[PDB]
Amino acid sequence: EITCQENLPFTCGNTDALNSSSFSSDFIFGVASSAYQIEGTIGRGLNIWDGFTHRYPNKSGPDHGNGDTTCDSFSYWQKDIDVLDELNATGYRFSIAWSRIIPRGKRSRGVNEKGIDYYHGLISGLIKKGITPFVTLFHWDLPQTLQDEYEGFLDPQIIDDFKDYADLCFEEFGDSVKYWLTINQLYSVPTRGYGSALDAPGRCSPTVDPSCYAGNSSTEPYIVAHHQLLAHAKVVDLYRKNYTHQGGKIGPTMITRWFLPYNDTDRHSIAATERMKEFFLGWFMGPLTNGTYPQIMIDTVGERLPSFSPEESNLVKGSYDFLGLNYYFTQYAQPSPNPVNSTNHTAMMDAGAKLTYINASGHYIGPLFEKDKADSTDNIYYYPKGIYSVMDYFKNKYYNPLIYVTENGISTPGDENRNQSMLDYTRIDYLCSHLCFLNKVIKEKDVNVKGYLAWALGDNYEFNKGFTVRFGLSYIDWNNVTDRDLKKSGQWYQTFISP
Amino acid sequence: EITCQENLPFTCGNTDALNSSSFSSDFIFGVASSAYQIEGTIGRGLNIWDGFTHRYPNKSGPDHGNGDTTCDSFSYWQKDIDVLDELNATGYRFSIAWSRIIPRGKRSRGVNEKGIDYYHGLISGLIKKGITPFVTLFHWDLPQTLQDEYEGFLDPQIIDDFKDYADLCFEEFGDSVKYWLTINQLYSVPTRGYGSALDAPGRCSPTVDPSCYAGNSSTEPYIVAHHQLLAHAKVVDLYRKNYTHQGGKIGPTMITRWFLPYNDTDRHSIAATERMKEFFLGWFMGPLTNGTYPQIMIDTVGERLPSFSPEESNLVKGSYDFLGLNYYFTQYAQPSPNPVNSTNHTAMMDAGAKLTYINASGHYIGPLFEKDKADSTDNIYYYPKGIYSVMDYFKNKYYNPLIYVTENGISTPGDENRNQSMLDYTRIDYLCSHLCFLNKVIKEKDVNVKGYLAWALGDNYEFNKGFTVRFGLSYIDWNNVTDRDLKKSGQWYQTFISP
Ligand SMILES: *[C@@H]1O[C@H](CO)[C@@H](O[C@@H]2O[C@H](CO)[C@@H](O)[C@H](O)[C@H]2NC(C)=O)[C@H](O)[C@H]1NC(C)=O
Ligand SMILES: *[C@@H]1O[C@H](CO)[C@@H](O[C@@H]2O[C@H](CO)[C@@H](O)[C@H](O)[C@H]2NC(C)=O)[C@H](O)[C@H]1NC(C)=O
Ligand SMILES: *[C@@H]1O[C@H](CO)[C@@H](O)[C@H](O)[C@H]1NC(C)=O
Ligand SMILES: *[C@@H]1O[C@H](CO)[C@@H](O)[C@H](O)[C@H]1NC(C)=O
Ligand SMILES: *[C@@H]1O[C@H](CO)[C@@H](O)[C@H](O)[C@H]1NC(C)=O
Ligand SMILES: *[C@@H]1O[C@H](CO)[C@@H](O)[C@H](O)[C@H]1NC(C)=O
């Protein structure tokens, strides 16, 4: 019988008690990255994260940081491989920058051979060290040209441009890459990119944020989400019809959270909690498992919710071999009004829920996850049991899928000096406590989880935060980015992997 | 009788001997800037100078600098006005960033109202201080979307997108702006952007520079130059047909140089010198004055030189009310082979000339202009008489045009400390020696020159050089960009203007 801790102090950093041998022999352990966050702009065209961070520097991070140079994995990809080799990792998730291989967006405009060569060399280097690549086609970095031609995922033109990009990736890299992710965190671009305008491309209703160049936060999230699902599904169909000889697997990436009632004896909070599951997870998992959006979304969102045709429904339903599930934290849910006629209405209001990290009796859900220095009542707290609850829910609700945990990690402040930054015991605690619950759910609930990739390989540009936080298991000096030095967490993870 | 110095030491920094009163009462004196170089990316979309500097950081400058934040004239435009007011300047040349007012490139995709407001406030502030705006529509910063959709000026689609952009500018700003420049330095994008790939977008033949993503240095410069002329001419026709009520004037910007024979008794060097005038100046001025390219270009370039239809010829011929002439330096010319079958052939080779700053007897043409620390035999030297020779030539060869000198200036090294940087006596010498010759040519040759704008108002991002050189008449601290402090040159220029 497995017992796992939910509160500080944690004792799962002892590899005598928790290590890779606790999991099945074939289980993959590694780390993750994304292209905007690590590569730099050298050698690629411009994408909407370049555009957004440059047009709206205060939205890029408090330091106005961006991905222009970052950790320079364009130059230092071998050093990334070296970290993975030091870890004895068996997996690495990275993304392909669309703008590096097709700078002009549309494949018929030509490819960048040198960009293709960059990923060939990375892939070959990984495989030579026994590391399985997990490759994200689209980690938010849409070529700027496509956003300017037709507003990107706002328009159905995205589907064929994404398909042709993906086809090039399968053609060039699929002989070696056997695990593909289509779109990173399906929920995020619709809501943050087109709802709150916290993320690229930065569209919203005028009264939500007067700096947005255009948008409608009530309608566009739904349009974009719908196009994401269709573009994803078209790529999965292309993969499974035209690249079956490659013997690989493909799936989407979800951001997952668990949700608990703010007041577990209040029917209204219980209802809000179940609505959140539907609106947060079901928005995408309903289509992916059934070809339809959840009924509560149909009912609430009404004419703002697009319909799938019968052909589209069939294309989207079942459009995965596995799910990449990202998991960071859990929220309490309580009811909230949905003012659909307000000029500041957002899609996110349609769930009719307010989310907190403290429940009605004043209980904080778990240890600190992210401090918010401008408003401490907005601090985020984590909840290790949430990974158990999410995986159990996916198994039970969503037809026992094959799952890889494609991100899980925690930040430390960029204000810490290097010695403090390397002494990242809070990261060991977060990672181990989640791994304990992941082992527990696999054993107790028989969830088909076959790997775990911690966020992040190394310090990088963090969307929305610049270089003001660090997520890496290895440390990068922003004054001299060449080295990636394993932190205490990376050293712990090395021991966990090879105990 | 006016006597002007050609060699150090110069004594024209004495405003007792040379000042604004030496020129006609109406003559405009000011300074110049461009949008990529000064504004920053905040509040605008991405353009090909963002793309180029980010994809090819070693081509942005030795420091890998770029226009992301620069002097932040987005925030500090009032401080630019303040410099101009301190100078008692009567003119200011600035550019509109296309990506700030139409981030999606094509006008039908929507405009950025806040971008429009930015230029309205600048323009209104200038006029309130008695400063005449000279506004460049296109200072190289093409929206990235257009380059990615159709490769920008490589394709005739540029013409209508440029026209619709210009129409928006005339509509929004032409009630106040009475001097418009279409395209900055017509020669530069074809040759550097599409020939040598030193400049955005960075296209060339594969053996010219293997880093180029695509291109053909032998053909594309000509295509791009042809489209520039057509796009320019379509905008001038639009202006003069639809905006005549505004009572303003429009013209192109030329980069001018003079050319002297490397050996003034050698017929081959004399011939190369005359070819250079045709290939450098006539490439554009032939079309602008006659609707045809120079015969030597027709003959040499052959099938690589596009033809104008009779309608196009008529549109381009006479498509200016004035010329903005930029002038920095003069070169000696000697013959050079034109290897049209070589895989590394460039359009620039078609002139059949090699350019130097030292003549056959070892004479350097004038004082140092720009030191090249990697190769000192590649140092640039200036030649004050060249402004006289250029203006005389334009009057005689090109039908006595109205001229404004739209740039003239010199750099100092970014390695200098602030006190050295503010003690910019080399800049006084360059500016005064050229102003002396400009007065001389107006008086002696009756060239219709009606203003002079020195490059640059303040230190900025220099194309190709990052922040490794400074051109400003006012100093900017890159650690805190708010202030623009007049250098010795700016203080001199203040006295020259109001002696
Ligand atoms: C807030 O969360 C706390 C902690 O989960 C809940 O308190 C638990 O309540 C259960 C059922 O009453 C008790 O058996 C436990 O002993 C309590 N745990 C502790 C740490 O107090 C609490 O019920 C939640 N409040 C609401 C209103 O939902
Ligand atoms: C190189 O440039 C120098 C300077 O312009 C030329 O020298 C001048 O030559 C003229 C005509 O012979 C003489 O009257 C001057 O006195 C010379 N000036 C000085 C400073 O020497 C020289 O002829 C040029 N060489 C060539 C080969 O063209
Ligand atoms: C940040 O930038 C936007 C312009 O993009 C401006 O609207 C907003 O006021 C600025 N935010 C703060 C908090 O200053
Ligand atoms: C607009 O929304 C903000 C945040 O969503 C809220 O605090 C404010 O009350 C809203 N105003 C109206 C008019 O509803
Ligand atoms: C930068 O870091 C690398 C790796 O430690 C080191 O070899 C190189 O000398 C350092 N550069 C400077 C300028 O210190
Ligand atoms: C600069 O960058 C390009 C890649 O864009 C590379 O081809 C070239 O070798 C580098 N130049 C030098 C001098 O290192």
Ligand SMILES: *[C@@H]1O[C@H](CO)[C@@H](O)[C@H](O)[C@H]1NC(C)=O
């Ligand atoms: C290619 O050109 C470079 C510079 O243009 C020159 O130095 C070299 O000799 C040329 N090679 C051939 C094959 O002509």
Ligand SMILES: *[C@@H]1O[C@H](CO)[C@@H](O)[C@H](O)[C@H]1NC(C)=O
């Ligand atoms: C930056 O420069 C401005 C103008 O001199 C000054 O007022 C401001 O205090 C300076 N900022 C810092 C942080 O020194």
Ligand SMILES: [Zn+2]
């Ligand atoms: Zn940047």
